[PDB]
Design a protein around this ligand. Sequence first.
Ligand SMILES: CNC(=O)c1cc(-c2ccncc2)c[nH]1
Lengths: 263, 340
Amino acid sequence: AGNFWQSSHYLQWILDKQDLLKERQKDLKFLSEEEYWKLQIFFTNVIQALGEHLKLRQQVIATATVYFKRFYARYSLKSIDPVLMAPTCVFLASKVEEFGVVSNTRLIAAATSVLKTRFSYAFPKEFPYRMNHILECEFYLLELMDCCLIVYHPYRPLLQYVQDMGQEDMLLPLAWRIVNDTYRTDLCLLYPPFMIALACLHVACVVQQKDARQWFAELSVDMEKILEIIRVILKLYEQWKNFDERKEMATILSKMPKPKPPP
Amino acid sequence: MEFMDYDFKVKLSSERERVEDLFEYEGCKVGRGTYGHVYKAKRKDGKDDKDYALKQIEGTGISMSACREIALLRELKHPNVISLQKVFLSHADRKVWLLFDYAEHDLWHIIKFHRASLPRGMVKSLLYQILDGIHYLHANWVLHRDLKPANILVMGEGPERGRVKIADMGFARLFNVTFWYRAPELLLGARHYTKAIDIWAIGCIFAELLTSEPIFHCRQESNPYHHDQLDRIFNVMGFPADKDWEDIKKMPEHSTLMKDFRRNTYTNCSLIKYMEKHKVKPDSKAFHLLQKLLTMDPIKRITSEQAMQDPYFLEDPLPTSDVFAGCQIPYPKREFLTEE
Ligand SMILES: CNC(=O)c1cc(-c2ccncc2)c[nH]1
């Protein structure tokens, strides 16, 4: 609902970084850390594209993205095919976020056309799943997140901050776009959304050479934590420069652990 | 297609908690409705002796109602809102089951019990806990949108005796049939649900607790405009003067209202006269609070916080956390449904 400190997001889904890395070990027999991060970026982009095709608002997309990340923060890449999980997450997120239930034909046509059209460099073959798969996957996704469905994102507190600063017009479009970029990282699993929003607004000020040290210094907040986030954001832009997703992803997907078939 | 790892799949299936393995509930149905089915149930493993309620949601899969009720109750925690103990997802048939602590009573049955023939302490205490719960819900950006006596549970004997629990989040909404409890702005086509809409429903329930009759009772009759329900409301309340509800002019159905109704029809009608026929004193703090909840213009309706602060709740007798106040509960226990 509307107190973050009492939310299932805060109490169950803000994770320890070391435990997260520890849990990721299962999958790092197959993939380097670099490559695992690239896969995560890749599927964040797949989810973004699915939502764009379905004309869903940024909030639904973001919620879907958090579901996808929470799922693979606990379970292996081979547990459920992420190709099925991505649209499943979008489907469930549309309901939770009050858009409603995307129709059988529309969801499957979206998955089919988005992969063929925007990701053929990674997926030579057509989307092979149907609605009966989405439905079964959705049941597993719900139980496997312990029925946690309400997610807080950094957009709301960011809007509150820029308004408070009296700088909406100036700083909002860039800070907002940077929040979008944080979904390429694990930030949403690690920090309260209001801290992500402060870090993003900080990078926006720096990029736009706007001075706000005073406004920042009189917030009652752990600035050490904000700085850690700022570093992740700077690091994601260096990785973005060095990463060519279209050239690298087919090779990285074939390395990805696949589900073991029945015996 | 095999989308799931085989090892992962058998492990999950081995460890899955199954409603029919954990709970005894066959032949224990106590409610049936559009919500689905409610059962009174005991733990099979005898590890405690508590009664539990099990709600099998209407339909298959994750519908909008299942989705809302899980998503919101997962987050909410207040003594006056039903607690979601557990969710069971049944994969074979795609049924969703919710587990709650069992509430022996509810306002529908309590009010009916009295009408088939209400202590003022209990009335006040009930109202106070409804407002308490709705305020909590509101403070957390949740609109209930279907408040009615059947959704106001009261706990029986046990460690929460006489505690109100608001239930059924099936229609609830983040904001950040029978129309007796429906605010008049909705009947006139207002497009948005609002906190004020919940407060009207609570005024309807309060009147009913005072008199034992649904204040806007009306027979059954698509679009939001309901002629006869409006007619019943004007017969009780009077037809609003222009200065009582200036924005009535902006309601999508206002011209339909002007076409079907003449205010002169209701000149001797008021809430005062209605409540007087039913033995509530227009003088009473009770009455004055009721009139603030049942205000036609939603922007002139009191909020739950202000209602809780009302001097009615400072007047003797004070509201109690046990609405039955240590007295003997005369209300019959729910019966088991044995029909086909
Ligand atoms: C329409 N009714 C409902 O949604 C509902 C009833 C119960 C329940 C809980 C505890 N005891 C009795 C009934 C929970 N939800």
